[PDB]
Amino acid sequence: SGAIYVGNYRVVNRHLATHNDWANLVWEDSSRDLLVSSTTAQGCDTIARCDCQTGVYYCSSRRKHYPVSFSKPSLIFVEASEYYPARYQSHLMLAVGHSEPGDCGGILRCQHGVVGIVSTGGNGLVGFADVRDLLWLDE
Ligand SMILES: CS(=O)(=O)c1ccccc1CC(=O)N1CCC[C@H](C(N)=O)C1
Ligand SMILES: [Zn+2]
Numbered sequence: 001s002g003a004i005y006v007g008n009y010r011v012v013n014r015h016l017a018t019h020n021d022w023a024n025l026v027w028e029d030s031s032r033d034l035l036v037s038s039t040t041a042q043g044c045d046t047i048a049r050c051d052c053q054t055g056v057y058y059c060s061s062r063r064k065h066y067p068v069s070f071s072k073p074s075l076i077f078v079e080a081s082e083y084y085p086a087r088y089q090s091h092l093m094l095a096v097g098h099s100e101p102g103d104c105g106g107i108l109r110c111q112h113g114v115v116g117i118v119s120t121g122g123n124g125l126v127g128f129a130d131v132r133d134l135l136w137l138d139e
Contacts, residue, residue: 001016001060001102001104001105002058002060002104002105002106002107002117002118003105003117004043004045004047004107004114004117004131005039005043005044005045006043006044006045006046006047006114006137006138007042007043007137007138008038008039008040008042008043009026009036009037009038009039009043009137010036010037010038010039010043011034011035011036011117011131011134011137012034012035012036012037012105012117013033013034013035013104013105013117013119013129014028014029014030014032014033014034014035015033015081015083015084015104016104016105017035017037020037021035021037022035022037024037024038024039025037026038029090030084031087031088031089031090032089032090032091032092032129033084033089033119033120033129034129034131036134036137045113045114046112046113046114047113047114047131047132047134047137047138048109048110048112048113048114048115048132049112049132049135050110050112050115050132051072052110052111052112052115053069053070053071053072054067054068054069054070054110055067055068055070055108055109055110055115056068056108056109056110057095057097057106057107057108057109057118057126057128058106058107059097059098059099059103059106059126060102060103060105060106061098061099061100061102061103062098066097066098068095068096068097068108068126069095069096070093070094070095070108070128071093071094071095072093073090073091073092073093073130073132073133074090074091074092074093075088075089075090075092076088076089076092076094076120076127077089078092078120078127089119089120089127089129091129091130091133092119092120092127092128092129092130093108093116093127093128093130094125094126094127094128095125095126095127095128096124096125096126097124097125097126098124098126099118099121099122099125099126099127100121100122103118103121103126104117104118104119105117105118106118108128114131115128115130115131115132116128116129116130116131116132117129117131
């Protein structure tokens with residue numbers, strides 16, 4: 001579990017979004033596993049605007065932060081689940097690192113700020129849904 005709070009927005013994994021998130025819906029994309037909802041309070045997370053391929057992510061199943069090298073955002077096949085049928089997920093970045101069910105929502109950051117959130121994983125791999133192209137989160 002976990003979310004990004006920037007201005008009047010809350011960014012969460014779409015498969016984990018709440019009733020309140022859906023009642024205050026701004027934008028959602030099943031192919032990216034992202035949902036953004038509106039908030040009354042101000043969020044102070046800074047979003048990165050860069051092409052960094054190194055950073056640090058939070059792993060709740062280990063209660064630790066890990067440094068990682070990650071790939072550029074791309075279309076990657078993701079196996080079926082109680083949340084989605086088998087499909088390609090867009091804007092996805094992979095890294096060699098630990099992750100397991102329960103870790104989605106952990107933030108990935110570089111020196112410039114928030115890069116994305118854990119969205120997929122397994123087999124000594126971790127997948128991050130990128131948020132750096134969502135320029136409207138600032139304005
Ligand atoms: C079971 S796992 O793949 O090792 C793992 C690891 C870390 C974190 C999660 C998972 C499970 C997983 O990948 N998904 C279930 C939830 C929706 C995800 C999606 N984006 O389509 C896909
Ligand atoms: Zn960066």
